[PDB]
Specification:
The complex is a heterotetramer, with two copies of chain A and two copies of chain B.
Chain A lengths: L1 H12 L4 E7 L5 H13 L5 E4 L10 H12 L4 H14 L5 E5 L1 H5 L3 H11 L3 E4 L8 H9 L3 E3 L1 E2 L5 H10 L4 E3 L2 H10 L5 E3 L6 H9 L4 E4 L2 H8 L4 H17 L3
Parallel strand pairs in A: 1-2, 1-9, 2-3, 3-4, 4-5, 6-7, 7-8, 8-9
Helix pairs in contact in A: 2-4, 2-12, 4-6, 6-7, 8-9, 11-12
Chain B lengths: L6 E2 L2 E5 L5 H15 L2 H15 L5 E3 L9 E7 L9 H14 L4 E6 L3 H13 L2 E7 H6 L1 H9 L3 E5 L6 H15 L3 E3 L10 H7 L3 H14 L5 E5 L4 H7 L9 E9 L10 H4 L1 E5 L1 E6 L24 H8 L3 E7 H15 L5 H16 L5 E7 L7 H10 L3
Helix pairs in contact in B: 2-3, 3-4, 4-6, 8-10, 9-10, 13-14
Bound molecules: pyridoxal-5'-phosphate (2 copies), chloride ion (22 copies) and cesium ion (6 copies).
One chloride ion binds next to loops of chain C.
């Protein structure tokens, strides 16, 4: 989680927000995915959120379901994803790497062993998509024992009890879906810095997030859409990813 | 925080994205309130009786058990309106939707059986019903699609991901996460996140309560065992619930063995899978070594799923209920046997429960035993399946 | 000589070859005896309740009648085991066969519905059932043929004459004329020679007796009218019989109007045919000018016959019951309406009764009226027929 | 009915039995049927039993159902049958002609009018296949008013009450399906002379009937079988009919 603390400190010294793209690992294959990820960082991504393909995701929109199936159908496995993560970390010492996981893949061979493997490969945070704070105790405990930030979503429909729990239990960042008041209450309760992740697909939404006093913004699916649109041309895929990420990061500054 | 315990031992819970927790908490509150409300109970009793036809008969077999010491009764959920026990709980959940001030129902369906049940409850109660169904499923299920549309439901083809059941379920839940103020998600078995396993049991428990009263009246004692097939767990937990505290009564759940457990083509996670977390719950599921959910298989679509509801896993763990499997071929023989000897065409789901009872009888024919089979549904829907199989192997 | 009057006014009688008279006299005697025998009554009540599921619900429509002064109840014979009221009387006749010391049942079938009913009663009671069916019919009716065979009945294709229903019936009666010592002919409606119209009424009369008790309990009064479709007459006479002496209650029978009476493609002999003698009885039938029996037509196979049972002709003649017709298109609309607004898929036979009740409501929507429709059967069997029609005309 | 009285008297003077074939009128068409009927008489038939095609016969075996359908499908109507009957009677003054009718065709335009038309064309008897003695009153009354014999079947399963009724109500002949005792009781009760009609398909069954003291024998379907077998060759059809009838009549003598 220290990579996030260091990143936000540095961004604060530059009065900049963070820009964080999501992609599915291994979409549309392992080699292209590694290139995509290097392109995102080179183009100015501050941190990454990376998904591990799962047979039956029940918490992702159509764009993401489509990407899940490209990777999953191409035979990408969690073991291969963890090989990828080690390689990504080896190339990029300071970039925070967050995973977006389904509970079964974390629970499968033991929750503690999962976080231990995260720590071994250099992952910084884990968001478990189908574990609400009420069920989070064993996950966040294993995360913290292995120096991994547990990320929680603060949804539109949050109440004060939820704000206090997310603020208390999360580390790294708060994944945020009135707005300026959620940001204010999270700060009051000493929550991890907020990243706005609701429908972030254009530069003006990044600047709005910064203006609202959020630490930055997460693009939950715009990067995946670009992959989906450019499958037939890998070169163009990288070019459009680079342009998009560059534009989005410029909006944070 | 919840009003009721979301777990059965280690199994169950609420493993959903945070955004759906208020919806689950709302439903739990409404259910707890409804269960204390005599007027809700009276409205539910009225639908069950005057619309669905309860109580259901308890039929004594005679031809099937001749020359043995088994007395076998069938609890006739096949006679309920809609042809199966699913009707009971969709009516209750429809009333809960109205209690929460909602006029819309969301469901998903694969083979279409739960979709039809949802549509008929919604039609009766004047609710707007949308049913998500993977495009691949819509194309294969024209009869059930047509029945749902006749009942006024909107069937919404889902083309994303693999365009089958998981994708339909995802879309139904995405919808619900935005619409839960006005729409209720009608889960079709005793599984998924709390409070559904609890609600579904309580809205199916008349199966066992009636069975108990009927058996006492006819035999003057409780059954030696009650036997039910297990897809997600609803008919079986509805048969079992009223007998849980009668510790002399055996509770036997029958999972589909498919082509044989040893083949891996089965749907028997409770005895042959591994605990995992999916669809909102910690429960037994069929899994790959690396934690992907395996495809299940059964001749019977209603049993063909890779998981099971958590209260069954719990009852198993403590030894209160025992779980077994029956193969496609055993179920087929039971189907043929009931048609020929009792004039009842059972659902192939139910035929797995009947097959196990026939085995209890035939293996030990001088054992005195009073058995009740939960005949969850009728088998008109299965006659082509059975025909095709018998023809293929030359019968 | 007979024990009971074979006629209803001028209609009815025993117009069979001399060789079959002892068989009819035997059956009449056994029926008269059975009707006085508490143990026969108790055995019949037991099958009706514990195997078939009686009593059947009486369902109050609400959505269908909203904004009118009609209160409409449906007597839910669609919920009986087998999916229609036919089950009631086949069980009774099977018990009469056993009373006469017989262990064999003979029946004939065209579309296969009465054949299935005969087969299921015979399977339950361990009777050997042979069902004659014209070869042309066997080829068109694979589902019903398969259901009968699953139930252990022997389905015997008839290739003589036109290889359809009349030929099957002829062969069934030829058989019976030689075998009546050991075999009982199970007639499938309230028609044919005495004593069948009488027996079938008495073995269907629980429909109206239950209806009367249920309506009193729910409304505190008798219905203004009870409404039933009329193929051969059994569900309708079973609904009417207990109300005949309640002269304030209207008895409305609905014949199939087919493509329209004016087209001659209909099955409405009571109002649009001519008395004649055929199938053992003097009764209204659709006839050519020179006395050949005309082919009938209805969208619904169960109503598609050119005659009707004699007690209906009699009740009409004296003005105690009134008979109307409903066209294929009216029945189709009623089918769609019940599916959409009540979540019940009715048989297309029953949809003709419902269509008439909807017309009584819609024509005079401020008229206060308490109506009961005899929902004779469920309509799973009709979904392809309905689909095909709606598609053909682009719906 | 007087034709039967005269016939039996004459046969009695010759100590001969009667041989009576059944055919369907208009089988397999009107012209061929007329030839068939003339052949039967010429070959030695003592009387005829003639059927009128009916849409839904419920009292005839497969052979007869088949013939019914040949005539009926060829468009033979009752009006045409009555034209045929008048022509047959015009050719053959003394041969008794009996009809085998279904009740509907007799009842259709009035029972009395039906028998009046029988009398006009010269028919001598009518057997109504689906009217048992218990229902026969209006038919036998109309028959007798028009000088037509009402024929009744005395079945295998007859009792004494039935014997007495058939004996009392029938005229012309008794259609008979222990045997020597039925014949004895019918005579005791002054019944019309008995013709045995049970499965008469060979000469030895004709001689047996005579030996049993019956007045003769009726061939209910053997003639029809010959028609059915020879449809493709009308000439051969007549030849085989002639041989069969000649053999059967020889057995009566
Ligand atoms: C749906 C269904 C089942 C399986 O579901 P459960 O929730 O396990 O009861 C079993 N039998 C029938 C007839 C069904 O329709
Ligand atoms: C057979 C049948 C009928 C018609 O027969 P009736 O003897 O007139 O009752 C009507 N409805 C259903 C559902 C049937 O199965
Ligand atoms: Cl609690
Ligand atoms: Cl518990
Ligand atoms: Cl726990
Ligand atoms: Cl109460
Ligand atoms: Cl069904
Ligand atoms: Cl609606
Ligand atoms: Cl269809
Ligand atoms: Cl539709
Ligand atoms: Cl949606
Ligand atoms: Cl109690
Ligand atoms: Cl694996
Ligand atoms: Cl009488
Ligand atoms: Cl009467
Ligand atoms: Cl009379
Ligand atoms: Cl009593
Ligand atoms: Cl049915
Ligand atoms: Cl048998
Ligand atoms: Cl089939
Ligand atoms: Cl079979
Ligand atoms: Cl036969
Ligand atoms: Cl009473
Ligand atoms: Cl005509
Ligand atoms: Cs914190
Ligand atoms: Cs037994
Ligand atoms: Cs299962
Ligand atoms: Cs009303
Ligand atoms: Cs009719
Ligand atoms: Cs006489």
């Amino acid at each position: 989680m220290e990579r996030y603390e260091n990143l936000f400190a540095q961004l604060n010294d530059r009065r900049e927000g963070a820009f964080v793209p999501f992609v599915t690992l291994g979409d549309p294959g392992i080699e292209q995915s590694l290139k995509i990820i290097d392109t995102l960082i080179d183009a100015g991504a501050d941190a990454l959120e990376l998904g591990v393909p799962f047979s039956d995701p029940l918490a992702d929109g159509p764009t993401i379901q489509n990407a899940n199936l490209r990777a999953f159908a191409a035979g990408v496995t969690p073991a291969q994803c963890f090989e990828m993560l080690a390689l990504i970390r080896e190339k990029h010492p300071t970039i925070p790497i967050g995973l977006l996981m389904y509970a079964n893949l974390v629970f499968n061979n033991g929750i503690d062993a999962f976080y231990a493997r995260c720590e071994q490969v250099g992952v910084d945070s884990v968001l478990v998509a189908d574990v609400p704070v009420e069920e989070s105790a064993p996950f966040r405990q294993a995360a913290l024992r292995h120096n991994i930030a547990p990320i929680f979503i603060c949804p539109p429909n949050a109440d004060d009890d939820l704000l206090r729990q997310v603020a208390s239990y999360g580390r790294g960042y708060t994944y945020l879906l009135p707005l300026h008041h959620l940001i204010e209450k999270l700060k009051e309760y000493h929550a991890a810095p907020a990243l706005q992740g609701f429908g972030i697909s254009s530069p003006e939404q990044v600047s709005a997030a910064v203006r609202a006093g959020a630490a930055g913004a997460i693009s939950g699916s715009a990067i995946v859409k670009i992959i989906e649109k450019n499958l037939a041309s890998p070169k163009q895929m990288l070019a459009e990813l680079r342009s998009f990420v560059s534009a989005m990061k410029a909006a944070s500054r | 925080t919840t009003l009721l315990n979301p777990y059965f031992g280690e199994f169950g819970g609420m493993y959903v994205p945070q955004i759906l927790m208020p919806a689950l908490n709302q439903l739990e509150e409404a259910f707890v309130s409804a269960q204390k409300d005599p007027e809700f109970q009276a409205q539910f009793a009225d639908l069950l009786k005057n619309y669905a036809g309860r109580p259901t008969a308890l039929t004594k077999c005679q031809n099937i058990t001749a020359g043995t010491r088994t007395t076998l009764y069938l609890k006739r959920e096949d006679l309920l309106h809609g042809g199966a026990h699913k009707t009971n709980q969709v009516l209750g959940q429809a009333l809960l939707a109205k209690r929460m001030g909602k006029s819309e129902i969301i469901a998903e369906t694969g083979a279409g059986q739960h979709g039809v049940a949802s549509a008929l409850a919604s039609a009766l109660l004047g609710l707007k019903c949308r049913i998500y169904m993977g495009a691949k499923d819509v194309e294969r299920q024209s009869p059930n699609v047509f029945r749902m549309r006749l009942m006024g439901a909107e069937v919404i083809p889902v083309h994303s991901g693999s365009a089958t059941l998981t994708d339909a379920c995802n879309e139904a839940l995405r919808d619900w996460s935005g619409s839960y103020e006005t729409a209720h998600y009608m889960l079709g078995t005793a599984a998924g996140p709390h409070p559904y396993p609890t609600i579904v049991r309580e809205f199916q428990r008349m199966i066992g309560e009636e069975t108990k009263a009927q058996i006492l009246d006819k035999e003057g004692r409780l059954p030696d065992a009650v036997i039910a097939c297990v897809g997600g767990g609803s008919n079986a937990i509805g048969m079992f619930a009223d007998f849980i505290n009668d510790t002399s009564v055996g509770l036997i759940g029958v999972e589909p063995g498919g082509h044989g457990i040893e083949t891996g083509e089965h749907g028997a996670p409770l005895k042959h899978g591994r605990v995992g977390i999916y669809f909102g719950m910690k429960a037994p599921m069929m899994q790959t070594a690396d934690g992907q959910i395996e495809e299940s298989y059964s001749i019977s679509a209603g049993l063909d799923f890779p998981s099971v509801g958590p209260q069954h896993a719990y009852l198993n763990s403590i030894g209160r209920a025992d779980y077994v499997s029956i193969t496609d071929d055993e179920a087929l023989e039971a189907f043929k046997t009931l048609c020929r000897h009792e004039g009842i065409i059972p659902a192939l789901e139910s035929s797995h429960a009947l097959a196990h009872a026939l085995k209890m009888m035939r293996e030990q024919p001088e054992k005195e035993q009073l058995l009740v089979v939960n005949l969850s549904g009728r088998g008109d829907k299965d006659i082509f399946t059975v025909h095709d199989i018998l023809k293929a192997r030359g019968e």
